[PDB]
From Swiss-Prot, chain A:
It comes from Homo sapiens (Human). It is found in: Cell membrane. May assemble to form gap junction channel-like structures involved in intercellular communication. Channel gating and ion conductance are likely regulated by membrane lipids rather than by membrane depolarization or extracellular calcium levels. The lineage of its organism: Eukaryota, Metazoa, Chordata, Craniata, Vertebrata. Belongs to the CALHM family. This is Calcium homeostasis modulator protein 4. Oligomerizes to form decameric and undecameric channels. Two hemichannels can assemble in a tail-to-tail manner to form a gap junction. Coiled coil: none annotated. The chain holds residues 108 to 214 of 314 of the full protein. The gene is CALHM4. The chain crosses the membrane at residues 1-22, 77-100. Residues 23-76 are extracellular. Placenta.
Length: 107, 94, 94, 94
């Protein structure tokens, strides 16, 4: 399990720290209550533009302020989640090694 | 039961001022469809139209007034209102 | 039994406005053949012609009205209608 | 109980001078919203507006006077006051 764990933890840590994967994954789950620009009584176009602007839409129509703010929010959440994950992995590894030493009947 | 009608359009020469009125029985303005401006009295304008237009609304008359200054032939377009879509009125600049 | 005829053409000077009428006994407009615009009241325009033309249709008269503003000698062409192909009428700008 | 009203606006041609008055029953000025200038008699101005505007206030009348010299059509905007937000008055230059 030592090697079996060091193999993918690097992938998860690097991908979360870069943050692009997490951004493209959880873009559509962003909230719109904070931003008055996303009223959209239609309640269907708003979801589409929310899932659309992160990818390639560009199209500067002065909404790019909200795009940039929410992108920074998701990037920060991604990197903090990566730090939480690596800290938990290290703590689990140390605790597992200690438990292995304690539970080992051999000297 | 909610009906939106536009008024105050017509033909205005270069450098003129025009007033656009929408009657309502958060409002947004569009031109053709390109986004123009938004009201809530906090107000927001597009950069392509920034510094030229001013929007205000009064609850007593249930109408939104859009004051346009220094019109040019470049912004010759039909303007709609959005809260449902407004009918729109044609504005031409010669 | 479906026949499409065009009307409202002629010669118009620079900066003028012209109205194109097609009688029907989803519509598309073409000029020559280059794509122009489409109607359904949702409307679509080509970027080469964007901001100059407006299309509307009424079911009461079964005709589609194409309002053209600020014509130039560059768009001197024959315009067709497509739903079958329309006859087309020649429009010249001098 | 604190109310701010703006006065002294209107239409002024190129190169003219305009005086903006705000009545108070540290002050800051804004235009639309872009930051303009600040008073305390120590005074601060934005570089985009530096060397054109002068602000003074008197405690006897509880009003702040904003003296604008050499206006241009570029600064055609609505000016607000901030201490709470002022109502704002439209200034246009032709």
């Amino acid at each position: 399990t030592g090697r079996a764990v060091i193999a993918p933890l690097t992938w998860l840590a690097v991908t979360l720290l870069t943050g692009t994967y997490y951004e493209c994954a959880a873009s559509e789950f962003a909230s719109v209550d904070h931003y008055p620009m996303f009223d959209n009584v239609s309640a269907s176009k708003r979801e589409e533009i929310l899932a659309g602007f992160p990818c390639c839409r560009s199209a500067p129509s002065d909404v790019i302020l909200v795009r940039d703010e929410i992108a920074l929010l998701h990037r920060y959440q991604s990197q903090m989640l990566g730090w939480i994950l690596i800290t938990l992995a290290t703590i689990a590894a140390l605790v597992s090694c200690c438990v292995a030493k304690c539970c080992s009947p051999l000297t | 039961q909610v009906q939106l009608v536009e008024s105050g359009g017509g033909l205005v020469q270069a450098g003129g001022s025009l007033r656009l009125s929408c009657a309502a029985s958060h409002m947004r303005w569009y031109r053709q469809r390109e986004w123009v401006a938004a009201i809530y009295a906090g107000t927001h304008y597009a950069d392509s139209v920034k510094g030229r237009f001013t929007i205000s609304r009064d609850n007593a008359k249930n109408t939104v007034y859009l004051q346009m200054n220094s019109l040019k032939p470049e912004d010759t377009a039909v303007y709609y209102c959005f809260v449902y879509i407004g009918q729109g009125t044609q504005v031409t600049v010669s």
